[PDB]
Amino acid sequence: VVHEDFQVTEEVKALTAEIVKTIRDIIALNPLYRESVLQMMQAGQRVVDNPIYLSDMGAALTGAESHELQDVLEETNIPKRLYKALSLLKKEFELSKLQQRLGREVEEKIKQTHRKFLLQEQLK
Amino acid sequence: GAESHELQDVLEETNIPKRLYKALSLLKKEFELSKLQQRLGREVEEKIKQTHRKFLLQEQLK
Amino acid sequence: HLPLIAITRNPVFPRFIKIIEVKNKKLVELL
């Protein structure tokens, strides 16, 4: 289990911060699991002594297939796997954003159809 | 987002000008850190978008 | 003259509303 890290453990957590913030955004846009795990597992409480496993949970919280997760697990370099997890997160971000945008497009268009019927009666 | 040690060191400074200057310097350092992280994430996101847009086209096709 | 409250990584910025939560019940009796 490779667990290499920089002795300058000051600016590295920012990435994890980003990731958790990113992960937060996930649950904000894509409800998958209870936000309670975020509540108890707070990165600012100094309770995450194995941040590699926090990154693993974040990757698991993504919808990445088994192939992408295997590729990530094959990344021993902590920064590289973290950036790959960021890439998967961004992929799912765009996927869900397009899904919600298209659903909203459909619903507004149906509402416009109903309003067009209303206004066709008003035209009559 | 200055760490607790930064806050304690700021509180250590007594004179209002000195503590205010330390707060300004901490603000500058936090701004630099945010800028650096945003630049790194921007480069990584650009490299992700370095993926041909046909990747997004196949996403749409699926 | 009260026992020190276990911070447990709960920074309280000045003039800032913050939340203190400690699993220990020994603080509940003191409260």
Coordinates of all heavy atoms in Angstrom, one line a residue, chain A residues 41-115:
Chain A
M41 N -17.3 13.1 9.1 CA -16.0 13.1 8.5 C -15.6 14.5 8.0 O -15.7 14.7 6.7 CB -15.8 12.0 7.4 CG -14.4 11.6 7.1 SD -13.9 10.1 8.1 CE -14.8 8.8 7.1
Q42 N -15.3 15.4 8.9 CA -15.0 16.8 8.5 C -13.5 16.9 8.4 O -12.8 16.5 9.3 CB -15.5 17.7 9.6 CG -15.6 19.2 9.1 CD -16.9 19.5 8.4 OE1 -17.9 19.0 8.7 NE2 -16.8 20.4 7.4
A43 N -13.0 17.4 7.3 CA -11.6 17.5 7.0 C -10.9 18.5 7.9 O -9.7 18.5 8.2 CB -11.3 17.9 5.6
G44 N -11.7 19.5 8.4 CA -11.2 20.5 9.3 C -11.1 20.1 10.8 O -10.5 20.9 11.6
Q45 N -11.6 19.0 11.1 CA -11.6 18.5 12.5 C -10.3 17.7 12.8 O -10.2 17.2 13.9 CB -12.8 17.7 12.8 CG -14.1 18.5 12.9 CD -14.1 19.4 14.1 OE1 -13.3 19.2 15.0 NE2 -15.0 20.4 14.1
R46 N -9.4 17.5 11.8 CA -8.2 16.8 11.9 C -8.4 15.3 12.2 O -7.5 14.6 12.7 CB -7.3 17.4 13.1 CG -5.9 16.9 13.2 CD -5.2 16.8 11.8 NE -3.7 16.8 12.0 CZ -3.1 15.8 12.6 NH1 -3.6 14.7 13.0 NH2 -1.7 15.9 12.6
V47 N -9.6 14.8 11.8 CA -9.9 13.4 12.1 C -9.5 12.4 10.9 O -9.6 11.2 11.1 CB -11.5 13.2 12.4 CG1 -11.9 14.0 13.6 CG2 -12.3 13.6 11.1
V48 N -9.1 13.0 9.8 CA -8.8 12.2 8.6 C -7.2 12.0 8.7 O -6.5 12.8 8.1 CB -9.2 12.8 7.3 CG1 -9.0 11.9 6.2 CG2 -10.7 13.2 7.4
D49 N -6.8 11.0 9.4 CA -5.4 10.7 9.5 C -4.8 9.9 8.3 O -3.6 9.7 8.2 CB -5.1 10.0 10.8 CG -5.2 10.9 12.0 OD1 -5.1 12.1 11.8 OD2 -5.4 10.3 13.1
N50 N -5.7 9.3 7.5 CA -5.4 8.6 6.3 C -6.0 9.2 5.1 O -7.0 8.6 4.5 CB -5.7 7.1 6.4 CG -4.9 6.4 7.4 OD1 -3.7 5.9 7.1 ND2 -5.3 6.2 8.6
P51 N -5.6 10.4 4.7 CA -6.3 11.1 3.6 C -6.3 10.3 2.3 O -7.1 10.6 1.4 CB -5.5 12.4 3.4 CG -4.2 12.2 4.1 CD -4.5 11.2 5.2
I52 N -5.4 9.4 2.1 CA -5.4 8.5 0.9 C -6.8 7.8 0.8 O -7.4 7.7 -0.2 CB -4.3 7.5 0.9 CG1 -4.3 6.7 -0.4 CG2 -4.3 6.6 2.0 CD1 -3.0 5.9 -0.7
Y53 N -7.3 7.3 2.0 CA -8.5 6.6 2.0 C -9.7 7.6 1.9 O -10.8 7.2 1.3 CB -8.6 5.8 3.3 CG -8.2 4.3 3.1 CD1 -7.4 3.7 4.1 CD2 -8.5 3.6 2.0 CE1 -7.0 2.4 4.0 CE2 -8.1 2.3 1.9 CZ -7.3 1.7 2.8 OH -6.9 0.4 2.7
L54 N -9.5 8.8 2.3 CA -10.6 9.8 2.0 C -10.7 10.0 0.5 O -11.8 10.2 -0.1 CB -10.2 11.1 2.7 CG -11.4 12.2 2.7 CD1 -11.4 13.0 3.9 CD2 -11.3 13.0 1.4
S55 N -9.5 10.1 -0.2 CA -9.5 10.2 -1.6 C -10.2 9.0 -2.3 O -10.9 9.1 -3.3 CB -8.1 10.5 -2.2 OG -7.3 9.4 -1.8
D56 N -9.9 7.8 -1.7 CA -10.5 6.6 -2.2 C -12.0 6.6 -2.1 O -12.7 6.2 -3.0 CB -9.9 5.4 -1.5 CG -8.6 5.0 -2.0 OD1 -8.3 5.2 -3.2 OD2 -7.8 4.4 -1.2
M57 N -12.5 7.1 -0.9 CA -14.0 7.3 -0.8 C -14.5 8.3 -1.8 O -15.6 8.1 -2.4 CB -14.3 7.7 0.7 CG -13.8 6.7 1.7 SD -13.3 7.6 3.2 CE -12.4 6.3 4.0
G58 N -13.8 9.4 -2.0 CA -14.3 10.4 -2.9 C -14.4 9.8 -4.3 O -15.3 10.0 -5.1
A59 N -13.4 9.0 -4.7 CA -13.4 8.3 -6.0 C -14.6 7.4 -6.1 O -15.3 7.3 -7.1 CB -12.1 7.6 -6.3
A60 N -14.8 6.6 -5.0 CA -15.9 5.7 -4.9 C -17.2 6.4 -5.0 O -18.2 6.0 -5.6 CB -15.8 4.8 -3.7
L61 N -17.3 7.6 -4.3 CA -18.5 8.4 -4.4 C -18.8 8.8 -5.8 O -20.0 9.2 -6.1 CB -18.4 9.6 -3.5 CG -18.4 9.3 -2.0 CD1 -17.9 10.5 -1.2 CD2 -19.9 9.0 -1.6
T62 N -17.8 8.8 -6.7 CA -18.1 9.1 -8.1 C -18.7 7.8 -8.8 O -18.7 6.7 -8.3 CB -16.8 9.4 -8.9 OG1 -16.0 8.3 -9.0 CG2 -16.0 10.5 -8.1
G63 N -19.3 8.1 -10.0 CA -19.9 7.0 -10.7 C -19.0 6.3 -11.7 O -19.4 5.6 -12.6
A64 N -17.7 6.5 -11.5 CA -16.7 5.9 -12.3 C -16.9 4.4 -12.4 O -17.1 3.7 -11.4 CB -15.3 6.2 -11.9
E65 N -16.8 3.8 -13.6 CA -16.9 2.4 -13.8 C -15.7 1.6 -13.2 O -14.8 2.2 -12.6 CB -17.0 2.0 -15.3 CG -18.1 2.7 -16.0 CD -18.1 2.4 -17.5 OE1 -17.2 1.6 -18.0 OE2 -19.0 2.9 -18.2
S66 N -15.8 0.3 -13.2 CA -14.7 -0.5 -12.6 C -13.4 -0.3 -13.4 O -12.3 -0.3 -12.7 CB -15.1 -2.0 -12.7 OG -16.3 -2.2 -12.0
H67 N -13.4 0.0 -14.7 CA -12.2 0.2 -15.4 C -11.5 1.5 -15.0 O -10.2 1.4 -14.7 CB -12.5 0.3 -16.9 CG -11.3 0.3 -17.8 ND1 -10.4 -0.7 -17.8 CD2 -10.9 1.2 -18.7 CE1 -9.4 -0.4 -18.7 NE2 -9.7 0.7 -19.2
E68 N -12.2 2.6 -14.8 CA -11.5 3.8 -14.4 C -11.0 3.7 -12.9 O -9.9 4.1 -12.6 CB -12.5 5.0 -14.4 CG -13.0 5.3 -15.8 CD -12.0 6.1 -16.6 OE1 -11.0 6.6 -16.0 OE2 -12.2 6.2 -17.9
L69 N -11.8 3.0 -12.1 CA -11.3 2.8 -10.7 C -10.0 1.9 -10.7 O -9.1 2.1 -9.9 CB -12.4 2.2 -9.8 CG -13.6 3.1 -9.6 CD1 -14.6 2.4 -8.8 CD2 -13.2 4.4 -9.0
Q70 N -10.0 0.9 -11.5 CA -8.8 0.0 -11.6 C -7.6 0.9 -12.1 O -6.5 0.7 -11.6 CB -9.0 -1.1 -12.6 CG -7.8 -2.1 -12.7 CD -7.7 -3.0 -11.6 OE1 -8.5 -3.0 -10.7 NE2 -6.6 -3.7 -11.6
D71 N -7.8 1.7 -13.1 CA -6.8 2.6 -13.6 C -6.2 3.5 -12.5 O -5.0 3.7 -12.3 CB -7.2 3.4 -14.8 CG -7.8 2.6 -15.9 OD1 -7.8 1.3 -15.8 OD2 -8.2 3.1 -16.9
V72 N -7.2 4.1 -11.7 CA -6.8 4.9 -10.6 C -6.0 4.1 -9.5 O -4.9 4.5 -9.1 CB -8.0 5.6 -9.9 CG1 -7.6 6.3 -8.6 CG2 -8.6 6.6 -10.9
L73 N -6.5 2.9 -9.2 CA -5.8 2.1 -8.2 C -4.4 1.7 -8.7 O -3.5 1.4 -7.9 CB -6.6 0.8 -7.9 CG -8.0 1.1 -7.3 CD1 -8.9 -0.1 -7.5 CD2 -7.8 1.3 -5.8
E74 N -4.2 1.7 -10.1 CA -2.9 1.4 -10.6 C -2.0 2.6 -10.6 O -0.8 2.5 -10.9 CB -3.0 0.9 -12.1 CG -3.6 -0.5 -12.2 CD -3.9 -0.9 -13.6 OE1 -3.9 0.0 -14.5 OE2 -4.3 -2.1 -13.8
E75 N -2.5 3.8 -10.1 CA -1.7 4.9 -9.9 C -1.1 5.0 -8.5 O -1.9 5.3 -7.6 CB -2.5 6.2 -10.2 CG -2.8 6.4 -11.7 CD -1.7 7.0 -12.5 OE1 -0.7 7.4 -11.8 OE2 -1.8 7.2 -13.7
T76 N 0.1 4.7 -8.4 CA 0.8 4.7 -7.1 C 1.1 6.2 -6.6 O 1.1 6.4 -5.4 CB 2.1 3.9 -7.1 OG1 3.0 4.4 -8.1 CG2 1.8 2.5 -7.3
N77 N 1.4 7.1 -7.5 CA 1.7 8.4 -7.2 C 0.5 9.1 -6.7 O -0.5 9.2 -7.4 CB 2.3 9.2 -8.4 CG 2.3 10.7 -8.2 OD1 1.4 11.4 -8.5 ND2 3.5 11.2 -7.7
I78 N 0.6 9.6 -5.4 CA -0.6 10.2 -4.8 C -1.1 11.4 -5.6 O -2.3 11.5 -5.9 CB -0.3 10.6 -3.3 CG1 0.1 9.3 -2.5 CG2 -1.5 11.3 -2.7 CD1 -1.0 8.2 -2.5
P79 N -0.3 12.4 -6.0 CA -0.8 13.5 -6.8 C -1.5 13.0 -8.1 O -2.5 13.6 -8.5 CB 0.4 14.3 -7.1 CG 1.4 14.0 -6.0 CD 1.1 12.6 -5.5
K80 N -0.9 12.0 -8.8 CA -1.4 11.6 -10.0 C -2.8 11.0 -9.9 O -3.7 11.3 -10.6 CB -0.5 10.6 -10.7 CG 0.6 11.3 -11.5 CD 1.1 10.5 -12.7 CE 2.0 11.3 -13.6 NZ 2.7 10.4 -14.6
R81 N -3.0 10.1 -8.9 CA -4.3 9.5 -8.6 C -5.3 10.6 -8.2 O -6.5 10.5 -8.5 CB -4.2 8.4 -7.6 CG -3.7 8.7 -6.3 CD -3.9 7.6 -5.3 NE -3.4 6.3 -5.8 CZ -3.7 5.2 -5.2 NH1 -4.4 5.1 -4.1 NH2 -3.2 4.1 -5.7
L82 N -4.8 11.5 -7.4 CA -5.7 12.6 -7.0 C -6.2 13.4 -8.2 O -7.4 13.8 -8.2 CB -5.0 13.5 -5.9 CG -4.8 12.8 -4.6 CD1 -3.7 13.5 -3.8 CD2 -6.1 12.8 -3.8
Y83 N -5.3 13.7 -9.1 CA -5.7 14.5 -10.3 C -6.6 13.7 -11.2 O -7.5 14.2 -11.8 CB -4.5 15.0 -11.0 CG -3.6 15.9 -10.2 CD1 -2.2 15.8 -10.2 CD2 -4.1 16.8 -9.3 CE1 -1.4 16.6 -9.5 CE2 -3.3 17.7 -8.6 CZ -1.9 17.5 -8.6 OH -1.1 18.4 -7.9
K84 N -6.3 12.4 -11.3 CA -7.2 11.5 -12.1 C -8.6 11.4 -11.4 O -9.6 11.5 -12.1 CB -6.6 10.1 -12.2 CG -7.0 9.4 -13.5 CD -6.1 8.1 -13.6 CE -4.7 8.4 -13.9 NZ -4.0 7.3 -14.5
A85 N -8.7 11.4 -10.1 CA -10.0 11.5 -9.4 C -10.7 12.8 -9.7 O -11.9 12.8 -9.9 CB -9.8 11.2 -7.9
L86 N -9.9 13.9 -9.7 CA -10.5 15.2 -10.1 C -11.0 15.1 -11.5 O -12.1 15.7 -11.8 CB -9.4 16.3 -10.0 CG -9.7 17.6 -10.6 CD1 -11.0 18.2 -10.1 CD2 -8.6 18.6 -10.4
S87 N -10.3 14.4 -12.4 CA -10.8 14.3 -13.8 C -12.1 13.5 -13.8 O -13.0 13.9 -14.6 CB -9.7 13.6 -14.7 OG -8.5 14.3 -14.5
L88 N -12.2 12.4 -13.1 CA -13.5 11.7 -13.1 C -14.6 12.5 -12.5 O -15.7 12.5 -13.0 CB -13.3 10.4 -12.3 CG -12.1 9.5 -12.5 CD1 -12.1 8.3 -11.6 CD2 -12.0 9.1 -13.9
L89 N -14.3 13.3 -11.4 CA -15.3 14.2 -10.8 C -15.8 15.2 -11.8 O -17.0 15.4 -11.9 CB -14.6 14.9 -9.6 CG -14.5 14.0 -8.4 CD1 -13.4 14.7 -7.4 CD2 -15.8 13.8 -7.6
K90 N -14.9 15.8 -12.6 CA -15.3 16.8 -13.6 C -16.1 16.1 -14.7 O -17.1 16.7 -15.2 CB -14.0 17.4 -14.2 CG -14.2 18.0 -15.6 CD -13.0 18.9 -16.0 CE -13.2 19.5 -17.3 NZ -12.5 20.8 -17.5
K91 N -15.7 14.9 -15.1 CA -16.5 14.2 -16.1 C -18.0 14.0 -15.6 O -18.9 14.3 -16.3 CB -15.9 12.8 -16.4 CG -16.7 11.9 -17.4 CD -16.0 10.6 -17.6 CE -16.8 9.7 -18.5 NZ -15.9 8.7 -19.2
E92 N -18.1 13.5 -14.4 CA -19.5 13.3 -13.8 C -20.2 14.6 -13.6 O -21.4 14.7 -13.8 CB -19.4 12.5 -12.5 CG -18.7 11.2 -12.6 CD -19.3 10.3 -13.7 OE1 -20.5 10.3 -13.8 OE2 -18.5 9.6 -14.4
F93 N -19.4 15.7 -13.3 CA -20.0 17.0 -13.2 C -20.6 17.4 -14.5 O -21.8 17.8 -14.5 CB -18.9 18.0 -12.8 CG -18.9 18.4 -11.4 CD1 -18.2 17.6 -10.5 CD2 -19.5 19.5 -10.9 CE1 -18.1 18.0 -9.1 CE2 -19.5 19.8 -9.6 CZ -18.8 19.1 -8.7
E94 N -19.9 17.3 -15.6 CA -20.4 17.7 -16.9 C -21.6 16.8 -17.3 O -22.6 17.3 -17.8 CB -19.3 17.6 -18.0 CG -18.3 18.7 -17.8 CD -17.1 18.6 -18.8 OE1 -17.0 17.4 -19.3 OE2 -16.4 19.5 -19.0
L95 N -21.5 15.5 -17.0 CA -22.6 14.6 -17.3 C -23.9 15.0 -16.6 O -24.9 15.2 -17.3 CB -22.2 13.2 -16.9 CG -23.2 12.0 -17.3 CD1 -23.5 12.0 -18.8 CD2 -22.7 10.7 -16.8
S96 N -23.8 15.2 -15.3 CA -25.0 15.6 -14.6 C -25.5 17.0 -14.9 O -26.7 17.2 -14.9 CB -24.7 15.5 -13.1 OG -23.5 16.1 -12.7
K97 N -24.6 17.9 -15.2 CA -25.0 19.2 -15.6 C -25.8 19.2 -16.9 O -26.8 19.8 -17.1 CB -23.8 20.1 -15.8 CG -24.0 21.5 -16.4 CD -22.7 22.2 -16.7 CE -22.0 22.7 -15.5 NZ -20.8 23.5 -15.8
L98 N -25.3 18.4 -17.9 CA -26.0 18.2 -19.2 C -27.4 17.5 -18.9 O -28.4 17.9 -19.5 CB -25.2 17.5 -20.2 CG -25.7 17.5 -21.6 CD1 -24.6 17.7 -22.6 CD2 -26.5 16.2 -21.9
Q99 N -27.4 16.5 -18.1 CA -28.6 15.8 -17.8 C -29.7 16.8 -17.2 O -30.8 16.9 -17.7 CB -28.4 14.7 -16.8 CG -29.7 13.9 -16.4 CD -30.3 13.3 -17.7 OE1 -31.4 13.8 -18.1 NE2 -29.7 12.3 -18.2
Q100 N -29.3 17.6 -16.2 CA -30.3 18.5 -15.6 C -30.6 19.6 -16.6 O -31.8 20.0 -16.7 CB -29.7 19.2 -14.3 CG -28.4 20.0 -14.6 CD -27.9 20.7 -13.3 OE1 -28.5 20.4 -12.2 NE2 -26.9 21.5 -13.4
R101 N -29.7 20.1 -17.4 CA -30.0 21.1 -18.4 C -31.0 20.6 -19.4 O -32.0 21.3 -19.8 CB -28.7 21.6 -19.1 CG -27.9 22.5 -18.2 CD -26.7 23.1 -19.0 NE -25.8 22.0 -19.6 CZ -26.0 21.5 -20.8 NH1 -27.0 21.9 -21.6 NH2 -25.1 20.6 -21.2
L102 N -30.8 19.4 -19.9 CA -31.7 18.8 -20.9 C -33.1 18.6 -20.3 O -34.1 18.8 -20.9 CB -31.2 17.5 -21.5 CG -31.4 17.3 -22.9 CD1 -30.8 18.4 -23.8 CD2 -30.9 15.9 -23.3
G103 N -33.2 18.1 -19.0 CA -34.4 17.9 -18.4 C -35.2 19.2 -18.2 O -36.4 19.3 -18.4
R104 N -34.5 20.2 -17.8 CA -35.1 21.6 -17.6 C -35.5 22.1 -19.0 O -36.6 22.7 -19.1 CB -34.1 22.5 -17.0 CG -34.7 23.9 -16.7 CD -33.6 25.0 -16.8 NE -32.7 24.9 -15.7 CZ -32.9 25.3 -14.5 NH1 -34.1 25.7 -14.1 NH2 -32.0 25.2 -13.5
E105 N -34.8 21.8 -20.1 CA -35.2 22.2 -21.4 C -36.5 21.5 -21.7 O -37.4 22.2 -22.2 CB -34.1 21.9 -22.4 CG -34.5 22.1 -23.9 CD -33.3 21.8 -24.8 OE1 -32.2 21.4 -24.3 OE2 -33.5 21.9 -26.0
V106 N -36.6 20.2 -21.5 CA -37.8 19.5 -21.8 C -39.0 20.1 -21.0 O -40.1 20.3 -21.5 CB -37.6 18.0 -21.5 CG1 -39.0 17.3 -21.4 CG2 -36.7 17.4 -22.5
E107 N -38.8 20.3 -19.7 CA -39.9 20.8 -18.9 C -40.4 22.2 -19.3 O -41.6 22.4 -19.4 CB -39.6 20.7 -17.4 CG -38.6 21.7 -16.9 CD -39.2 23.0 -16.4 OE1 -40.5 23.0 -16.2 OE2 -38.5 24.0 -16.1
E108 N -39.5 23.1 -19.6 CA -39.9 24.4 -20.0 C -40.6 24.3 -21.4 O -41.5 25.1 -21.6 CB -38.7 25.4 -20.1 CG -37.7 25.3 -19.0 CD -36.3 25.6 -19.4 OE1 -35.9 25.3 -20.6 OE2 -35.5 26.2 -18.6
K109 N -40.1 23.4 -22.3 CA -40.8 23.3 -23.6 C -42.2 22.7 -23.4 O -43.1 23.2 -24.1 CB -39.9 22.4 -24.5 CG -38.7 23.2 -25.0 CD -37.7 22.2 -25.7 CE -36.6 23.0 -26.3 NZ -35.5 22.2 -27.0
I110 N -42.4 21.8 -22.5 CA -43.7 21.3 -22.3 C -44.6 22.4 -21.7 O -45.8 22.5 -22.0 CB -43.7 20.0 -21.4 CG1 -42.9 18.9 -22.1 CG2 -45.1 19.6 -21.1 CD1 -43.6 18.3 -23.3
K111 N -44.0 23.2 -20.7 CA -44.8 24.3 -20.2 C -45.1 25.3 -21.3 O -46.2 25.9 -21.3 CB -44.0 25.0 -19.1 CG -43.7 24.1 -17.9 CD -45.0 23.7 -17.2 CE -45.2 22.2 -17.3 NZ -46.4 21.7 -16.6
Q112 N -44.2 25.5 -22.2 CA -44.5 26.4 -23.3 C -45.6 25.9 -24.2 O -46.4 26.6 -24.8 CB -43.2 26.7 -24.2 CG -42.2 27.5 -23.4 CD -40.8 27.0 -23.7 OE1 -40.5 26.5 -24.8 NE2 -39.9 27.1 -22.8
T113 N -45.6 24.5 -24.4 CA -46.7 23.9 -25.1 C -48.1 24.2 -24.5 O -49.1 24.5 -25.1 CB -46.5 22.4 -25.3 OG1 -45.1 22.2 -25.5 CG2 -47.2 21.9 -26.5
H114 N -48.1 24.0 -23.2 CA -49.4 24.2 -22.4 C -49.8 25.7 -22.5 O -51.0 26.0 -22.7 CB -49.2 23.8 -21.0 CG -49.2 22.3 -20.8 ND1 -48.1 21.5 -20.9 CD2 -50.2 21.4 -20.5 CE1 -48.4 20.2 -20.7 NE2 -49.7 20.2 -20.4
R115 N -48.8 26.6 -22.4 CA -49.1 28.0 -22.5 C -49.5 28.3 -24.0 O -50.3 29.2 -24.2 CB -47.9 28.8 -22.1 CG -48.2 30.3 -21.9 CD -47.1 31.2 -22.4 NE -46.6 30.9 -23.7 CZ -47.3 30.9 -24.8 NH1 -48.6 31.3 -24.8 NH2 -46.7 30.6 -26.0

